RNA sequence: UCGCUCAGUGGUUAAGGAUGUGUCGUCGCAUAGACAGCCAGGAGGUUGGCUUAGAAGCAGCCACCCUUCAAAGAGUGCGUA
């Protein structure tokens, strides 16, 4: 749900990065790339959703990056295979920004849900 | 911190790094106090006190005044720690320092009337007792909630007086024999 | 809402309450400071809105506005911004935000609050002063009518940046 | 029942100073719970 | 009528009370009818088939009954001149249900024996909005 | 000089928390001596139209106009078909 082929590959590598923007309403933030495990981003608005409402639309500002290549566990001493895990990684930036009242961040109160690390709301 | 309160003047406390106690109509109250604290009486009023500044009297005082009261009730004050009961019956009696309370099982259980709050009974539907305590006074008011727990539907036996709090229900509500 | 202060260097920018601060006001450069007690009186209601005075360690009396906003990324202490003051002849960045606010008439047949995520607009401003006076997020959302920015009430005059289509606050609910 | 940063949930749950705590005590009668 | 009365209220229909679905002996056994439902709203309760009719129905230790109500035609007068079809869906969602222009005369024009106001600037503040539930647009305020 | 100070961490450890704490900015305000712990006010059009047994302040959809009076909420939570 990423790229449709074009190629594996990618390293590591942590910091922070480059894609905050001064928010409208309320903000939120990452905060370092974290833990998030793709099959846990794919159970980050749906967790966002139980029920918000019948429709609904806000807007967010990342995308899943990812591959990890994890093989198997016969005897791990070779070279590779293929991803078979998949994350997004991220620095500190908007995801959410509510544009309701009296919510304010109800669906960004279970966001931290789905986050062993800290993730901010903020506000802006 | 405090210091007014409501007492004539038939009562005399100490100055002694802490020994002090009452000596009204029964008393004699357990006074046992620190070093950094201690104050001197001035009358037939009271002061308040600040030998050092910060969190020294701010912990074993500005509440000094206060514990008096565990001796106001009985030097003038009154006592009495009044309730009902309603699990089986309202029967209790003395006879020395034993209370049988009637209800239940033949297996005893007695419990060991105190000194103070050991009882007088004259009306048996509820239970009268003296108690100069104010240690044992809600205690012994609690003495009744660790093991023959009220039922947990109509208003029986924990009651204070008269408030909202109504019997507990489940589902909806019944009862007969 | 005084001034004084100096170092040339990133050591009073770095600890605790301060901030960094930049001038390069007509023969007036220099990188001072100031505290950070009411500063953050930015966007809040006084953004571009009205223009009152500061007393400098010294000379003169420069009114200047805000120039954008920013806080700070991720947290919450705004490492340094940026700094206008009126008293140059030709930079870039205005500060004319697009907000949105009310009930929302979406639960006509599905869409929820004014979203907007972006923080950049179709704006120019020929001098250096940003007003505050705009709407630009309501006008019936439904079709046949949106609202988004093109011209809009615009400032004062007209607009000058590249091609004027952004996409800001619009409709689609 | 859990041993970390959980909020004090109702202000009417008082923090309690203990042996190091954070407590929740809700707003009438329905959860006493403590670590 | 020993020396106490009771409360209670009830939104007593068009007099259904007497075969058995309605709710005739399945609302009578503590005093409220079982024998008696005629000349008790259906006394002058028979100015129209489908009303209302308010009352705070006094039910004593004795099961005689009588009358002592309130006055009915204080709501109904805007009760007969629409109906109940197209009138209440969902409102906010266009720009359903309609009564009249001059039909706001007459339509707050009653609040006198019943509203304990009934003045001028009075008398049709409380009514007002009747259909308010139905969510319309006034077209006139009594004037 | 002196704080967090009181857990023995400091000598294997964290996402989430508890109205513990030395200290910097606002607020409706106890130089109307407010709220936070009470006495008295606690009802009318409408007890709202509608799924209609009544649903009548509370099994439902929707909706918030005024009244005795110098003001008072289309009703949070209790009982509950």
Same mark, same amino acid.
């Given at each position: 749900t990423k790229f449709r082929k074009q190629f594996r590959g990618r390293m590591t590598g942590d910091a922070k990065g480059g894609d905050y923007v001064a928010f409208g309403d309320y903000g939120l933030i990452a905060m370092e790339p974290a833990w998030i495990k793709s099959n846990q981003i794919e159970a980050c608005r749906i967790v966002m959703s139980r029920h918000f409402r019948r429709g609904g639309k806000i807007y967010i500002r990342i995308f899943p990056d990812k591959p990890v290549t994890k093989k198997p566990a016969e005897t791990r001493m070779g070279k590779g295979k293929g991803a078979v895990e998949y994350w997004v990684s991220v620095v500190k930036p908007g995801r959410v920004m509510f544009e309701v009242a009296g919510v304010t961040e109800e669906q960004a109160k279970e966001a931290f849900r789905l986050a062993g690390h800290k993730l901010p709301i903020q506000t802006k | 911190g405090k210091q007014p309160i409501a007492v004539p003047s038939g009562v005399t406390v100490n100055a002694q790094d802490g020994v002090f106690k009452v000596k009204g109509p029964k008393g004699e109250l357990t006074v046992p106090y620190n070093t950094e604290l201690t104050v001197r009486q001035d009358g037939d009023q009271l002061l308040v006190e600040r030998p050092s500044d910060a969190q020294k009297h701010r912990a074993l005082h500005g509440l000094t005044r206060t514990l008096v009261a565990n001796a106001v009730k009985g030097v003038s004050d009154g006592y009495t720690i009044n309730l009902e009961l309603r699990g089986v019956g309202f029967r209790a009696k003395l006879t020395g320092k034993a209370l049988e309370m009637n209800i239940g099982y033949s297996?005893?259980?007695?419990?060991?009337?105190?000194?103070?709050?050991?009882?007088?009974?004259?009306? =048996?539907?509820?239970? %009268?007792?003296?108690?100069?305590?104010?240690?044992?006074?809600?205690?012994?008011?609690?003495?009744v909630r660790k093991v023959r727990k009220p039922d947990a539907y109509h208003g029986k036996g924990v009651? !204070?007086?008269?408030?909202?709090?109504?019997?507990?229900?489940?589902?909806?509500?019944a009862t007969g024999g | 809402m005084e001034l004084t202060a100096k170092p040339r260097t990133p050591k009073q920018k770095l600890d605790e309450s301060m901030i960094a601060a930049v001038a390069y006001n007509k023969e007036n450069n220099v990188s001072f400071?100031? %505290?950070?007690?009411? !500063?953050?009186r930015a966007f809040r209601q006084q953004s571009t809105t009205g223009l009152f005075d500061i007393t400098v360690e010294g000379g003169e009396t420069f009114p200047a506005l805000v120039k954008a906003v920013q806080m700070d990324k991720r947290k919450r202490?705004?490492?340094?911004? %940026?700094?206008?003051?009126?008293?140059?002849?030709? =930079?870039?960045? #205005?500060?004319?935000? #697009?907000?949105?606010?009310g009930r929302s008439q979406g639960e006509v047949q599905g869409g929820l609050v004014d979203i907007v995520v972006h923080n950049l607009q179709i704006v120019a401003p020929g001098p250096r002063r940003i007003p505050q006076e705009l709407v630009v997020d309501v006008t019936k959302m439904n079709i046949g009518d949106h609202i988004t920015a093109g011209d809009i009430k615009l400032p004062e005059g007209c607009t000058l940046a590249a091609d004027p289509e952004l996409t800001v606050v619009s409709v689609l609910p | 029942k859990v041993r970390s940063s959980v909020k004090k949930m109702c202000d009417n749950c008082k923090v309690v100073r203990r042996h190091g705590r954070v407590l929740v005590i809700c707003s009438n009668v329905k959860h006493k719970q403590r670590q | 009528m020993k020396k106490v009365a009771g409360i209670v209220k009830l939104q007593l229909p068009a007099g259904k009370?007497?075969?058995?679905? =309605? #709710?005739?002996?399945?609302?009578?056994?503590?005093?409220?009818?079982?024998?008696?439902?005629?000349?008790?709203?259906?006394?002058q309760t028979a100015d129209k088939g489908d009303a209302i009719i308010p009352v705070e129905i006094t039910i004593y230790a004795d099961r005689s009954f009588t009358f002592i109500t309130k006055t009915p035609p204080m709501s109904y007068l805007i009760?007969?001149?629409?109906?109940?079809?197209?009138?209440?869906?969902?409102?906010?969602?266009?720009?359903?249900?309609?009564?009249?222009? %001059?039909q706001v005369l007459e339509i707050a024009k009653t609040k006198m024996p019943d509203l304990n106001a009934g003045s001028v600037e009075a008398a049709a503040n409380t009514v007002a909005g009747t259909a308010r539930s139905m969510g319309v647009t006034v077209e006139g305020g009594p004037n």
């Open positions: - | 297996h005893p259980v007695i419990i060991e009337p105190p000194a103070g709050v050991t009882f007088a009974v004259p009306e =048996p539907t509820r239970i %009268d007792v003296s108690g100069i305590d104010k240690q044992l006074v809600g205690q012994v008011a609690a003495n009651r !204070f007086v008269g408030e909202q709090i109504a019997l507990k229900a489940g589902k909806a509500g | 400071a100031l %505290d950070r007690k009411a !500063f953050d202490a705004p490492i340094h911004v %940026d700094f206008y003051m009126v008293t140059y002849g030709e =930079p870039v960045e #205005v500060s004319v935000p #697009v907000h949105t606010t | - | 009370a007497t075969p058995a679905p =309605p #709710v005739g002996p399945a609302l009578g056994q503590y005093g409220a009818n079982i024998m008696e439902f005629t000349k008790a709203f259906n006394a009760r007969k001149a629409a109906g109940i079809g197209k009138g209440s869906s969902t409102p906010n969602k266009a720009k359903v249900g309609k009564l009249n222009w %001059d």
